[PDB]
# Entry
Amino acid sequence: AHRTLLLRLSDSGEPVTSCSYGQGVLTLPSLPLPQGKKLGDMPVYTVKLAIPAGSPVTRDGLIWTNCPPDFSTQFDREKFYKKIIKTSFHEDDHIDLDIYVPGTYCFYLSFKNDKDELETTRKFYFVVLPILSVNDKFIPLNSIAMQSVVSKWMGPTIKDWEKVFARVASKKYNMIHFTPLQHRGESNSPYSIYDQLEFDPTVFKSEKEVADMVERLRTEHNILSLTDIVFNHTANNSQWLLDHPEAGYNHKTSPHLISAIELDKKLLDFSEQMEALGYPVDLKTVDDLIKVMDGIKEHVIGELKLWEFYVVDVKQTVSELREKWGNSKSWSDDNIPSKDDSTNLAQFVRDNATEPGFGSLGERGSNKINIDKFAAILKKLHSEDYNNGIEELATKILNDINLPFYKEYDDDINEVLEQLFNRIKYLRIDDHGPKQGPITKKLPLSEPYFTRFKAKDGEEYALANNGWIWDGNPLVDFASSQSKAYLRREVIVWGDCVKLRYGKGPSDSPYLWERMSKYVEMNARIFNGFRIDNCHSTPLHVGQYFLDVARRVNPNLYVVAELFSGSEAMDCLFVERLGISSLIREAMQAWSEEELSRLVHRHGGRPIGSYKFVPLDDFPYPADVKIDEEYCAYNPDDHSVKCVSEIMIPKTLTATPPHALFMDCTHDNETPNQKRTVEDTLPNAALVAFCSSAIGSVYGYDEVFPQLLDLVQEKRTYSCAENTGISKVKTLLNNMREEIASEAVDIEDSEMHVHHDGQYITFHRTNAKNGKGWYLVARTKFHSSGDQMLPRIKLSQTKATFKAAFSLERTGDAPISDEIIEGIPTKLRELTGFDIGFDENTKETSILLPQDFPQGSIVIFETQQLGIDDSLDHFIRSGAIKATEKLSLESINYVLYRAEQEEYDYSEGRSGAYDIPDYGKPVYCGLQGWVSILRKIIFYNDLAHPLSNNLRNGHWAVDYVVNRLDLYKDKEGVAEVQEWLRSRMERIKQLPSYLVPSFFALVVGIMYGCCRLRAMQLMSDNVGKSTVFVQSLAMTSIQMVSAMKSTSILPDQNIAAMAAGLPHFSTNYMRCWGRDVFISLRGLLLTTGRYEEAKEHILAFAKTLKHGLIPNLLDAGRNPRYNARDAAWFFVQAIQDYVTIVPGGVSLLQEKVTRRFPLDDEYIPYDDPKAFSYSSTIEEIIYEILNRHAGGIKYREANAGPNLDRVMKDEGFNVEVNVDWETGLIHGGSQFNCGTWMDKMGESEKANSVGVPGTPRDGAAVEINGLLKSCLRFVLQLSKDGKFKYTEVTKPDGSKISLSSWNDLLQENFERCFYVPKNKEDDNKFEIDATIINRRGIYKDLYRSGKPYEDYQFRPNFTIAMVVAPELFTPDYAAGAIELADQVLRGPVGMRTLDPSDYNYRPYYNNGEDSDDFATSKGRNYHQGPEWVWCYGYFIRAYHYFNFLTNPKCQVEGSAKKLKPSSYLYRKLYSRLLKHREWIENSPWAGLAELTNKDGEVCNDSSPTQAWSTGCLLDLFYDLWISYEE
# Structure
């Protein structure tokens, strides 16, 4: 069925973190295969790679992966296969990796660079864990219990062992770990292995014998099995080591050690001779030991040559300077330092006259001088005749060249013997570990740093033996030439074992790799898995090759490791790459009670009532997606990984920290008896067993063996004494974990609380799905340390049950046999007394311990959270999509959005937004307001957040979410969305308080997503099928369109009405604005498919035409304000846009609006019969504009007087407009005016600007003439289709012009008037006064404005013309001018309203500024430098269009030959929208600002979400979509 995880990638191909669980690994959860299917039948998992539309990495991009393409094919690490990324600017691409088998996969991406070169990402890995079963019940990897058993103490026969098996089987472990079962070396330590390729001959003779024993364990006891494996060494006496000595590091393979070798056999030769010389074979004084290493002083150091190994042979160089003085006999460069700089001459020679490998170590005198390039320098520098001063000089230099070599040596030597007088102390005189064995055959003073033998090739050899550096970096190979550890004696050794020298591969030690390869596959055929000592010292390529070999033999190879690399990061890399399935953690390492609870915290699980993940506002919601619609397409037999809700967005694949195997005791640590006490065995083991992880223990721990068994020496056998000490308790713990393991699954489904008081440690373990749990109280016996009483234990909304309790007591000392290892005797007393109070009111359980609860005791309760049952999560995850069945794009506004003020509108000021104490209010009232706060909270599991705090403190926020909708209950679909939220929130309130936040954030999240999905569906495909960014943009449409009480777009009715902005442009007269609506209409209503409500808005304003113009301030069409010269042209572009896009859209032109003013510009009689009095068709309306402008319009604003505008001057109120017919363009306004969009009217009395406009745009304005032109084009071709009756235009006199002449006049004259040529040359035909100029290659802001330099201003507006009337521009000039805009006028998120180089340029806007500045005070700045966002859309729409026409690099081939744009252009486009995607991502309002101060700087007065800021961006995407995606 469904076994698919989503793995989102960044724009740089990197996998994205869904959650913050820590430094981690992309593990996929172990799960049984479905019911009755083997490896192969189907994919085990499918990983969905998701790649962001338009990202750099989509460019000729490929997914690489070493994941085999079906089952038949074998995994090869470096065989990567190719996968093609389907580019689009709109839609993300998804690429499945099907995975047939467990192991270590990876992927990287290749793409073509911004330099047109190839590039390549990091490799990224993910592990697919093995399936363990035993006969045919599945073992969840975290309900593993493993017993480590050392073979050589099990008895010398197989059924002496099968005895041991039967004992652990009773304690109910289900895994055994074997130290290696391989014929062992001279010291018989089971890690120094004699022969890798056959087993211990004491017991076994063939593979078949051991195989049967292990299959027996399986079948008899349900116990899986796994071995140690050793890579790092082999036993100092293997008969193949005589054959192949090169497989270790010898004087041949690794020369550097030669010096260290002759130091090591200068003590196998010193310490038998040592009893003849000097006083101490054994003594334990401290003034004495000086007389020993004063025996090292002279007998070794002194007799080893001052170490010619570093130092150049001074006289036997000079020697060979006289010999061959005569051959290459001078230099003649001036590479020559003189004898002034006695140290720079010194290594000048070092650079130029040396034989290879100078400085480094080798054979004894291997550092030496190239003599005829030495004589050749000396000849130039001093003399050609030797007898003139050369013996002095050559020697002087060479003494100076060895100065740093000598102090290399003194530092070297002091470590050689310090590392020695500190060792032999603790080796003999006991600091903390006794045994002063003097000399022997077998035990000299110092240990064998090398293994000596005569080989079958005949020559002698010295292979070292490995060990570890005290606090060295284990990633460093200390046998390798990088280290000096064998020389300085910085190596704690193992004589048992010998170097294994693998190289960079099989070519570097061929037999070694071959032998280990069929060593590894041998055990793989038998065992379920490996264990790996000191894996941080196995080089990565080595470890990877062999574990991969193993996994081909055994697909389900389980792998454990003791891995303590430098850091958590390198731990995770090793895990990543090697395919390690568990890491070894050690309970016994804790020095203290606090260290232990900390450890138990790490591997315990997640906090109780932790937040659960959901798709929020950061995911796409494909309109075309599958759903579980009552979360019911699951079947428990299928063993499907499950979607977070009804929507099938699949489970995400995120980093998780690598799993653990927690060992209460390993076969290398000291005993409870030793390190703490024996009675500790019981609690220490219980705390560990309560961890949500895998647990294990060595044999002996449970049976309380008194001291750690010496792996090397001991030959006594495990007692057969059954059921001692903890045995009976381990049976309980492991049995309990079996019951558990059946239902917990991934990291979010088991939770924990751990408390440490004194010598107690508490542990509450809880299942997040059903609320069942286990409470462990554990008194600890690190020392006997006095009676301690523990506080009462309070469990909220929980009932609790006694399960079991125990004390474990020492009955004197351990017996002293010499052939049977035996336990300490112990009493295991069952305890009683525990009191369990339940308050039937507060629903609180309290738990009192009894005063007889000695250290070394435990008690276990079963416990059940109230109100949670197994069926809760179905409930919460079902019903939500049907409950949204009836929503509409309007009604979704009420559920998701609604600023406080917009809510006050419906509540008569009573209600507003929920105030989170210590925090504030969400920014919307509906679910977007919660979700915008929740997304980070969930991501960091921040249960400390004020909202989290509030949500468990009380049900208020819970109830607020449900109650608001009473305001909007009657709206389409809101009733049934409310009822879903009611029914779920009801059921949540019945939970334990601390569980409420996680569940509140889940109900909200689920309904949010369902709502956002519903929107995408109701919208048009281009939007319903695109990236997060675009859908984010689109959702804005729903933010802005709302019905209200205090306003509408219709004077008779309240109906949906596009606000200009939230919160401040949402209520009363402040909501609707013609300019705003009709710029934004195509963006937010056409592009999104909101056709019927685009229409309503055009019809609404068409009622309010007057003076042949459209009003900006719309007062629901009840006294609108007509100071808008721009608005009518944006509105008659909106009508074109509508007709162009909407199917059957010409239908609009004969729609009839009751025109509710009179056909003059007559007075204001809102309440007459002459209001409803006469009909206009949109047909007449359009011409009525075009024609009335033509004949001329002159008026003074109705009701003009201070009661509209109380800063506009008397003259300001009469404005007007007509056409210069030598050019055909519209003119209008004055210096007392504000008829454009840039309409800031100045008002500071202290700055002296009251009634001065900041930016009147008097005269010919680029937008309006652009738009006019576009109107004329539109009607002409409409005439040609018989959809427009008119060609007649009357002028002031009475003359007539065809529309098509007016059209052609603009065509012949627009570019002439506005353009400002590059070449001074042609200033005589583009109407220019060069004195007043700023930048050429520009399109003018205005033609013949009041103050001429405002004509020659570089501004973003001309762009609107470029977009709507491209015909007006000779491509090359346009391209050039928009390039200038890109360089000069483009902010990060918004368009610079005035060229920085202008002296008027003030780019910070503050509306309250009181000060005396003429340009800035009280906001006058508004449009002279601040960065506006809608302008950007027009800007980039045009930048797209004209680069596409101009620049050959911006085109490529079509299918069915049509020019589409190149990826070179798409990149440029994409670059310019990152900051917008960033903005709407990371803004509490889920939208784009109206405006920005200089260079991105946030502007506090800017509206945070603006209709046209987002509409204009959408306008871009729609261009691209409707022009290319077919």
In short: The two ends are 33 Å apart (CA to CA). DSSP finds 38 helices and 60 strands in the chain.
